Enzyme design. Structure first.
Site, short mmCIF file in Angstrom:
data_model
loop_
_atom_site.label_atom_id
_atom_site.label_comp_id
_atom_site.label_asym_id
_atom_site.label_seq_id
_atom_site.Cartn_x
_atom_site.Cartn_y
_atom_site.Cartn_z
CG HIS A 7 -0.09 0.11 2.44
ND1 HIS A 7 0.34 -1.10 3.09
CD2 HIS A 7 0.13 1.16 3.49
CE1 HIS A 7 0.69 -0.47 4.35
NE2 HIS A 7 0.71 0.60 4.38
CG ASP B 271 0.55 -6.01 3.07
OD1 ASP B 271 1.07 -5.45 1.88
OD2 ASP B 271 0.01 -5.07 3.72
CB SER C 11 3.29 1.69 7.19
OG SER C 11 3.19 0.30 6.68
#
EC number: 3.4.21.90
Lengths: 163, 163, 163, 163
Positions: free
Chosen positions: A40, A62, A114
């Protein structure tokens, strides 16, 4: 106090931010000759060597991973699987490891932090922060970690928001 | 010491960087009513006047050139063709001119410092830095210059890397 | 002096600059619960709350204008229909109001000066600057404003420049 | 704090809480010789004489008007319609009245404090608080009031929650 200074001294050269038109939205990780980077978070790698590569993808776990060359494998993070419960070091202070779950007290946590690895009292990466969910007063983390067998386990609580 | 301060005082208003999503990858040059800008450096001109023009191309010499308007021709760099051997001023210190070749000592030189003009002890541009090649301890430059006749000569050593 | 500092204190909270790729092109005003943005200024509003809102356009008055969310409605400027002659305030010093013409002593007012709200002797917005022309030794402005009926009135002198 | 003493000393005789299981849900107000009580507040009047009445409903204006016995018509609030801009004196301090809207600074206003009157600097009721919505740093109020014609007017902002 000194814990944030130790995080800044350990993660000085090995942590590279991800730029997107001047905005810092994520952080990659260079450990074990591998370059971990989430899905992302989209942007260009600030490092010139790590940007001109090809990252194999894993959308279920991910994670994008690549092969760090041999002239940089010594200057990586450390990693281990032996972890007890209790306290660990994080970039904004401390993080609690209880019942196999990482919890962070509130006040901190936004969009952009993140990919920050979780360190211990010795200097080894035990988890990689990917997401977080607000639980009452004390938020929980959606992270990845390893085990004794060698299987990358992705822990994800209910209704998490990606950072 | 004071040489870098003189470079910053001479190249303050006349040097405009090239932006590419917030990254500085090159520098144009405004001299003689002309705007020199390389091919491999791609991006938008930070100046608003110089960006809304049309630059004629020369891929063999590796130069884009344009016409600076008359209200800015007085605020340009100076240029000359009379050059002896020895030392010259550069943005990161000094540069040696030996046997018709520009050499820079090591330690400096990365991707982004392309297009910086080479100055002298009087304040005239003698060369434009385009590329560099690592030669032992002392790197060599791949530049352009002029002569007494008026022919733009491009000097390029073997196996150069574009900056 | 003194007048500009309370205007800076007001503009730090509610006047938002636009984000062109490296610079500031214009200023979005939030007055009365209705976000205002000039047309020839192109970029992105700094707030992620004010960026997502789609704007309606009014080409006769040169202003995009959308509605502000409900939380932001108390933290807006105020607007006044009644303006007597004399002196009003502005980010770049003072502005004269004479015969229905906001004029400014010259040397100031260039590109990137758009949407700055002209305040008053109380802290309420009476006009919004969109540009101006150099009327000799003193420049006049091209503003939109309001009257007693509730009708947005735009005044523009001869051959103004869209700042 | 001096105005809040006046409000409490005027509410000590003429304001009655509407208790359901002991919990406060609202306040009956005896203004001008007629009992007032909102619809959505559930419970009974604390005063025994006022609880044994037949309150005629009026479902549009969120009120349940009644009539006061003749021995109690002198122990009522006085009221007015006259309302210039400025400040008024609520139960929790002050309340701004600008552009025909009563606004309180935020934080205060929950389930229960509905039916409270708003006083002026003379000691007359100008509004009766029914509900309100939080517009960020300041909470607009939904009240009923009167005018110069002698007509009861209710003002209601957008998305108001019944208190």
């Amino acid at each position: 106090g000194k814990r944030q200074r130790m995080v800044m001294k350990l993660e000085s050269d090995k942590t590279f931010p991800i730029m997107l038109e001047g905005k810092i939205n994520g952080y990659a990780c260079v450990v074990g000759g591998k370059l971990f980077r989430p899905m992302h978070v989209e942007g260009k790698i600030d490092n010139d060597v790590l940007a001109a590569l090809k990252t194999k993808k894993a959308s279920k776990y991910d994670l994008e991973y690549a092969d760090v060359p041999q002239n940089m494998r010594a200057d990586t993070f450390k990693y281990t699987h032996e972890k007890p419960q209790g306290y660990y070091s994080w970039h904004h202070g401390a993080v609690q490891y209880e019942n196999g779950r990482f919890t962070v007290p509130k006040g901190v946590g936004a969009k952009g932090d993140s990919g920050r690895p979780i360190l211990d009292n010795q200097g080894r990466v035990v988890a990689i922060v990917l997401g977080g969910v607000n639980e009452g007063s004390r938020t929980a983390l959606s992270v990845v970690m390893w085990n004794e067998k060698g299987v990358t386990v992705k822990y994800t609580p209910e209704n998490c928001e990606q950072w």
